[PDB]
Amino acid sequence: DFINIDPLQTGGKLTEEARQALLEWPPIHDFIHNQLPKFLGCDVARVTNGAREAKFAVMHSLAKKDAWVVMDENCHYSSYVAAERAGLNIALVPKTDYPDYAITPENFAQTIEETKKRGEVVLALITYPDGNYGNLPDVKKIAKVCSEYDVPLLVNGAYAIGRMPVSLKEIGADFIVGSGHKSMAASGPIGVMGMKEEWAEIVLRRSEKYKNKEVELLGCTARGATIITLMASFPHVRERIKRWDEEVEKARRFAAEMEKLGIKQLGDNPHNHDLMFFHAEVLYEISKKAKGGRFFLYRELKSRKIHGIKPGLTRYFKLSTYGLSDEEVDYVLNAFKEIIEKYS
Amino acid sequence: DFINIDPLQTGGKLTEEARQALLEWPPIHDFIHNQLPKFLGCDVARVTNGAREAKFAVMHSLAKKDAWVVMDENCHYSSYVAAERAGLNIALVPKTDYPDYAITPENFAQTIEETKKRGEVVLALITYPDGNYGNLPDVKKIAKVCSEYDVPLLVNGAYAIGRMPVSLKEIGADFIVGSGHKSMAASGPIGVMGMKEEWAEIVLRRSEKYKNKEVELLGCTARGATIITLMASFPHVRERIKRWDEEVEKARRFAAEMEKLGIKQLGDNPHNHDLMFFHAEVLYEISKKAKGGRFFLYRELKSRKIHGIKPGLTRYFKLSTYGLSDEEVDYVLNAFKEIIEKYS
Numbered sequence: 001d002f003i004n005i006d007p008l009q010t011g012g013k014l015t016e017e018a019r020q021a022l023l024e025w026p027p028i029h030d031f032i033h034n035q036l037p038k039f040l041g042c043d044v045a046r047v048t049n050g051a052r053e054a055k056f057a058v059m060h061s062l063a064k065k066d067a068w069v070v071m072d073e074n075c076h077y078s079s080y081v082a083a084e085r086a087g088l089n090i091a092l093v094p095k096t097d098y099p100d101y102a103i104t105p106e107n108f109a110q111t112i113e114e115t116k117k118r119g120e121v122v123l124a125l126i127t128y129p130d131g132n133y134g135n136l137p138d139v140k141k142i143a144k145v146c147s148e149y150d151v152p153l154l155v156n157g158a159y160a161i162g163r164m165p166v167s168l169k170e171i172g173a174d175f176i177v178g179s180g181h182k183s184m185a186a187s188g189p190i191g192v193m194g195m196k197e198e199w200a201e202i203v204l205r206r207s208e209k210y211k212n213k214e215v216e217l218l219g220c221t222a223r224g225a226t227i228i229t230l231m232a233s234f235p236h237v238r239e240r241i242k243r244w245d246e247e248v249e250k251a252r253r254f255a256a257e258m259e260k261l262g263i264k265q266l267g268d269n270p271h272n273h274d275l276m277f278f279h280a281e282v283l284y285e286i287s288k289k290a291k292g293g294r295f296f297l298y299r300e301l302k303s304r305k306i307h308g309i310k311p312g313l314t315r316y317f318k319l320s321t322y323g324l325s326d327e328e329v330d331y332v333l334n335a336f337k338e339i340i341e342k343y344s
Numbered sequence: 345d346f347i348n349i350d351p352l353q354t355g356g357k358l359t360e361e362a363r364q365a366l367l368e369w370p371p372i373h374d375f376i377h378n379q380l381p382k383f384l385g386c387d388v389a390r391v392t393n394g395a396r397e398a399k400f401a402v403m404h405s406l407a408k409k410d411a412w413v414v415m416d417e418n419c420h421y422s423s424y425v426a427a428e429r430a431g432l433n434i435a436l437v438p439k440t441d442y443p444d445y446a447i448t449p450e451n452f453a454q455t456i457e458e459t460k461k462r463g464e465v466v467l468a469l470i471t472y473p474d475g476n477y478g479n480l481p482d483v484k485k486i487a488k489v490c491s492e493y494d495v496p497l498l499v500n501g502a503y504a505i506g507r508m509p510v511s512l513k514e515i516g517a518d519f520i521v522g523s524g525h526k527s528m529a530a531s532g533p534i535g536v537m538g539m540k541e542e543w544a545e546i547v548l549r550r551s552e553k554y555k556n557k558e559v560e561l562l563g564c565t566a567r568g569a570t571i572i573t574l575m576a577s578f579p580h581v582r583e584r585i586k587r588w589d590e591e592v593e594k595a596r597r598f599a600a601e602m603e604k605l606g607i608k609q610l611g612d613n614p615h616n617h618d619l620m621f622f623h624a625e626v627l628y629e630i631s632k633k634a635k636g637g638r639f640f641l642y643r644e645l646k647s648r649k650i651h652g653i654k655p656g657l658t659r660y661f662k663l664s665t666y667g668l669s670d671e672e673v674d675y676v677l678n679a680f681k682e683i684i685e686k687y688s
């Protein structure tokens with residue numbers, strides 16, 4: 001047993017219901033036509049083989065010869081590759097400078113304009129929050145900047161859906177995407193996608209021969225342990241978001257402790273998500289003389305039953321406090337106190 | 345306990361090690377770079393989110409505006425929808441008439457030649473075996489036809505890989521696809537794709553920005569319970585193919601008894617696969633006078649611990665005798681004899 005602080009896994013721990021259900025192996029229609037569209041606050045929802053497949057599905061459905069897509073600079077590499085696969089030209093809206101690193105409804109709107117000059121822009125996307133810093137840009141705002149430029153907006157909420165409350169309609173965007181494995185306590189690759197009833201005729205167009213199948217999801221009804229676990233955990237995930245405020249308070253507290261210890265939290269301040277990016281100089285210098293150098297931090301934590309940071313990182317790194325109990329939060333803050341002290 | 349005779353599932357039973365492995369939850373690099381290519385007899389091999397994703401990936405990589413793909417009429421709807429999603433024109437090579445329903449090298453060649461008349465044919469595809477009849481066309485010969493016509497050939501081996509020995513090199517085709525959940529005792533949506541090295545830089549092309557990620561696969565390493573079960577069941581799957589001949593002798597034995605009862609197996613005769621499609625005019629007639637109507641068969645079967653045939657089907661239906669013991673085979677045969685006597 002280890003205390004896990006990997007941002008990729010904290011929101012993906014399997015539920016008891018899901019763990020036990022993954023064994024045995026369903027109201028799937030109910031789940032996607034009713035429960036899911038509600039939960040996402042949108043008209044139509046579909047399950048995909050991952051958030052990046054959901055993104056590619058809409059990009060590909062809207063792409064046109066040489067068209068463009070504008071996505072924030074803090075985007076997920078999958079958002080970018082998905083764009084390359086859809087054959088779109090890619091424009092990145094720049095981020096605020098250190099240590100905010102934010103995507104402002106202005107820089108975004110400018111980038112849109114300065115690019116609507118390079119060719120047709122058929123899509124725009126903001127990552128909410130982004131996977132590098134856990135910053136939550138102002139989507140309600142950006143959804144307007146797009147609604148008043150007539151470009152459709154896709155919200156990449158891989159780190160939002162299943163963690164904090166979200167509503168496509170409350171946001172005012174065209175598409176919303178979520179990840180079952182990083183924020184919905186489900187397994188294998190699985191994603192969720194929600195859109196306005198007006199796009200189901202495009203993104204969810206049917207086959208000319210198999211009028212019952214959807215072209216963009218390759219007629220996949222995608223059953224397997226994947227959908228089962230997603231569903232099994234859904235009740236708990238629904239409840240779970242009612243604690244988001246606690247989660248953020250807990251993260252804020254933690255960063256404040258790191259602050260005192262010398263390692264600084266970047267991006268949103270106060271931060272508004274469990275995923276935090278830290279600048280730990282006192283640790284980078286200790287790596288110059290440490291037992292294993294770059295890998296000292298890892299070894300040290302591995303020893304202290306703590307896994308979650310990419311081994312070899314010391315000057316900068318990200319982590320998540322998501323499902324940690326207060327004792328576990330303290331234990332980690334303390335591991336850092338000790339390690340720093342130990343080395344000089 | 346229930347005896348399973350459903351074709352989608354007989355080759356997908358989760359392995360002992362896969363079940364347990366799924367519990368706890370790796371040499372993934374060894375698997376895809378060395379083990380898998382060896383098992384498929386190909387240069388390069390990748391893991392994908394289902395055979396259909398693998399099929400779409402190459403269709404998308406080879407497509408050109410208004411180009412064509414020719415695939416056999418017995419093809420899987422996912423093969424067809426994949427082609428629609430890639431925006432290609434589809435030409436179906438026709439099958440021989442009842443009772444055979446075969447795809448012949450001759451009709452394939454004719455179809456290619458006639459299609460080459462309507463535009464560029466960028467790809468051909470034979471399903472081996474088709475999922476309706478379980479017929480095994482002569483791929484070796486269809487592959488030669490394709491070579492001499494200069495069109496790449498994709499072999500859809502969803503129902504072959506992990507059941508019978510297949511080698512892309514032996515067949516002489518360009519691409520081969522398999523399905524982990526239906527023929528490799530693995531869970532969730534997962535597939536396998538092998539190709540000749542020369543096709544690797546087209547289909548497995550990297551991203552411009554993230555030179556380490558492959559576009560067609562959306563840079564997805566693909567971890568999860570999915571790949572876990574696939575690797576966990578692989579040793580058994582590699583050895584289980586050494587028993588293919590038993591499996592077909594068993595299937596032929598089954599079909600022969602069925603005929604004695606009035607229900608006739610269509611397609612290849614002698615049959616060369618565990619998947620069999622039957623014509624049971626006797627059951628269809630009993631349904632016109634029987635207890636539950638079209639559901640009487642489901643009922644009688646469900647009642648005898650037998651699952652596998654879509655409920656409401658009595659005239660024609662497919663089934664698989666894949667991993668059944670000779671006693672389970674005999675049991676299912678006897679169940680049919682009885683259900684027939686019981687109603688006449």
Ligand SMILES: *Cc1c(COP(=O)(O)O)cnc(C)c1O
Pocket residue numbers: 049050051052053075076078079127129130131156158159178179180181182189190191
């Ligand atoms: C992981 C991630 C994705 C894609 O998630 P999948 O379901 O594995 O495709 C997209 N965006 C961000 C920010 C992510 O971290």
Ligand SMILES: *Cc1c(COP(=O)(O)O)cnc(C)c1O
Pocket residue numbers: 393394395396397419420422423471473474475500502503522523524525526533534535
């Ligand atoms: C099920 C099936 C496929 C695709 O299977 P997946 O792994 O779910 O994509 C392809 N071809 C045939 C004949 C099939 O039966």
